[model samples]
Target chain A: SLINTKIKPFKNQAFKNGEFIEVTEKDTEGRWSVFFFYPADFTFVCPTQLGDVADHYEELQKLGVDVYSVSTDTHFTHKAWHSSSETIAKIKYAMIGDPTGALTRNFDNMREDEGLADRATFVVDPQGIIQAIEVTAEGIGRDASDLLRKIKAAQYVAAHPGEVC
Target chain B: SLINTKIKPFKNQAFKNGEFIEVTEKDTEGRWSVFFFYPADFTFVCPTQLGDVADHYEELQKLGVDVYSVSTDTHFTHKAWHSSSETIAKIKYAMIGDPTGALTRNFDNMREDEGLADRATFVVDPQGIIQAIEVTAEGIGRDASDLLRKIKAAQYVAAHPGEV
Candidate 1:
């Protein structure tokens, strides 16, 4: 039920640089984007996961990618965690505090029964088309290296129109 | 009023896998502790900060340090973010969901005006004494390697006797 689809409209309060910034579909427009969904902020496994992505963030930025990390928590909570946790303290990407889960629901990442999101990753090209998607079980955290690799592949596929097979 | 004080008692729900786990002050007993605070999740500076620490998690574990990352988000949100976000997904440290700000307030990291926590780091010795604390501004993020250095110092002072 996924792959090569356009992202839906979303408006959210994203925590950035000691401020509560607003983010929406317009931000993802005109950019190659990554919509990264996580369950929550203050938890085990999640920090390691976010930390791994944080390690590669500079590389991603160099590749002309904009990363959006999302969860069900409010932007207020996002700011709170950013101000508190050591692991989460390293993030330099857009933090989408989706307390309403509208964004998460839009991406089909939400777990309806739990009022949380599934561990999911989606790579959207500059055209706003999702090029790749992956979902993992709760205990099984994902690797940023693999996600980076996929992003490269997606970019290559998008860049080379002559290689369509 | 700031240095070498005992951390106040608090209980919180921490996210682990598919469930919400309860974490409390009692968990820090008999261990070297680091309460690493940041501004928020899914933000511009916090991931790099958390990721840097995740890089050192193995080493921190070997050093007998119990690191708890705190924020005002509930453990439920922590689990959801952990499950969904890639940068956050790599975290193996205990993410303390301080939705009520109890623990955040205990560490003086709470931003009363915004209802969030200020960027702060506290190193608690085994005896539950606060040894080193550092708080950074919003735009500036801390180095993980430096935090490791401070933790080592905290441990050295706790283990050594008759040393200044």
Candidate 2:
């Protein structure tokens, strides 16, 4: 299971923000999609990250991008975190919850030992290909705005269809 | 070389932010440290990560941990980015200016063709040992809190002193 090839795992799953919405590979609209996941709510470094991306939501939207900030926490917990945490309050994208750790495992971040998704992020293009991915260990903090920069880079390569040299 | 048996790269670098003075393993500290490398300044995802980690410098500090955020930009440019970018300005950790790209290469993050770090994070222990590392391809952003969690877990094992 070296997994030399990129992960082609994308399945449409029902995601509930207030209710439920289907988040699928097709949602990218022939554009790019960002799947940003955090460990939990009300933590030391999660808010700064979740909030910073929230600040950049509009710009990514204009680029025809579909964004979802996911977490091991349920969508219900996402609502609570959004309502309570000042940093996460600005998030506008759909919050995808993978409580069973299936979605998390697909991207390959489940702790197994703890049954939690380690903080992970995935950038997928319209073709349902994984353009880029970053998985940090548990103690590390993730940056949201940085995720935007990465998305832009991937989109550039996809559009140019050549080396981004 | 393939860098077998606990490499000691990224040596001889210095970064400072008032109360927080960062010394890379190549220079001062005996134990290794994690140097998260990324691309240019004043960009999108880079700031998000930089700022997020900056916000939690205190928590990392309490863990007896030291982190250095590095980019190809100079210390002066890093200062400029730190001043202009709202999110980046919050970073309290040392921002190493790797204008030479030497350190970047030593850690195997340099995109030799593109001349940019390959969006990677490495965790080095007190013995200057790189216990674990992850290199992010294009378009991906990493999670810092989880990294902190991993750091603690790593430290926990380090304290336990092996055998398990």
Candidate 3:
């Protein structure tokens, strides 16, 4: 029930566009952001979901949203996966490395027994408040088209208050 | 965070197939189930979401899944909405009345301030364990096709364990 709650403050290293960059909660202010969490890098089902988001990254950017794909894997591993996999190479968004599980725990999405994050997606608004959440079990891939639709709806609601689409 | 958790027990009246019936967690114990929660009946975006699921009701039944559309509204109100709205009339699944908000709170989806449930959907397995969860804000409507895809995957994973 993280809905309508503000995200916890966090600072972490991320891989974006062949360079290691630093990202924090402050980076998300003044824009809509998506925190996309997966189990790990180079794992089955993770890449497909990330790639699907990658396909929609341009459009998402156009909509004033930033996508952050996170996993327990290190940024170095994300770089390797991005280098090895053609699908991963298309990713222009930040691939966050949360080996310490801090950010995942911040979202309450950590699988303590498995030491991996659940397949969770959180939509945060410009104020850092969570607007929507979607989590699925393994083997069930998410559809980016639906994510885009929700994002559009969120944007619409943000733009026009008191109106429900 | 309800993933892999078992659903709690509850029995409530529902409007299904033009009849007032009863449904419980037991009814979902031996089959796949979907608990689709929306804000309320006779509102915008809800009917579209419900009708979307209604369109897929036949296929979902073929896959051994039963849908229970739940809200804070009473069964009588659900019946009214079914009678008035052409979109809701297409629903063949049970429309569970949860005025007490017990079932909605059980899934941690109740909007206490609004006294309504969030736009949430949960996929429960035959054992009553929840497999997936989706919750959106007021304006974002859910897509049933995505729900169907997740149900197929859940069924696949259930049929083949220890393979993941």
Candidate 4:
């Protein structure tokens, strides 16, 4: 239940576009963000879900939102997956590598037993406060259309104060 | 994250089908259940969200899913709202009254400052394990169609174990 809570600070390496980059909580300042978490790379369901978000990355950017797909895998593995899979290659957003699980734990989305991240998505406003959260068990795919709808709603609420949807 | 975690046990009064009834975690045993939490009974956006679920209540029932809408408001308040509002009257599922916030706290959804529950939804399996969770801030309404899709997927996975 991270609703209305500010995102914790963390610095991590990420694979974005064609190169490796550094990402931190400061990068999320003054922009809407979606912290998308999945179990692992090159596994079942992760690619499809990541690709779904990739398909809508342009729209998300147009809405002033940045999408960060996170996992416990390292950035090196992210680069390998990006170069290997056609679905993973469609992603242009930062593929955050959290091998230490610090960022994953920040969101309280880690699977301690398996050392993997759960299928979770958090919608964060410009101020870094989480506006919405959705988490599903393994084998269940998330719909990007719903994510976009929620982001729109969040932005709307932020734009118009004292209004309820 | 409540994913794959078993729900805590609790008993509370609820309003259902024009009558007051007692509901507990035992009632959710051996059946797919949905714990739908809202800020209060008669607030903006809540009735529409509750009614949306109500509109799909029959389909959810056919899928062997029971919905329990919970808030800190009492069952007496729930009955009054059901009796007065056309939108609320559409609900046939149990409207759980969690005045003490124990049940809401069990789900880790109580708004401590507001003394109310957040706009949250948890999809639980028949075994009482939560499979999916959705919580939105005050102004963002949840879509019930997505809830149905997740429940169907959870059921599918349950039926075909070890076959992600």
Chain A TM-scores of all predicted models: 0.95, 0.81, 0.97, 0.98
In every candidate, how many clashes are there? Answer: 69, 35, 0, 0
Best by TM-score: 4
Off by over 4 Å in 3: A163-165, B160-164
lDDT string for model 3 (A17-88, tens) is 999999999999998999999998876668889999999999999999999999999999999999999999
Q: For each candidate, what is the lDDT?
A: 0.75, 0.65, 0.91, 0.94
Q: How would you encode candidate 4's per-residue C-alpha lDDT over A21-93 as one tens digit per residue?
A: 9999999999999999999898866898899999999999999999999999999999999999999988999
lDDT for residue A111 in candidate 3, whole number 0-100 = 90
**How large is the i-RMS for each model, in angstroms?**
20.6, 8.7, 2.1, 1.6
Number of the top DockQ candidate: 4
Decreasing lDDT order of the candidates: 4, 3, 1, 2
Error of 4 at B163 (Å): 4.6
Q: What DockQ does model 2 achieve?
A: 0.12
Candidate 4: Cα lDDT at A73 = 96
Among residues 3 or more apart in sequence or in different chains, the pairs in candidate 3 whose N, CA or C atoms overlap within 3 Å are none
Prediction 1 TM-score vs. true: 0.50
For model 3 chain A, the run of ten residues with the poorest summed lDDT: A156-165
Query: TM-score (chain B) for model 3?
Result: 0.97
- Per-prediction TM-score to the true structure, in the order listed: 0.50, 0.53, 0.93, 0.98
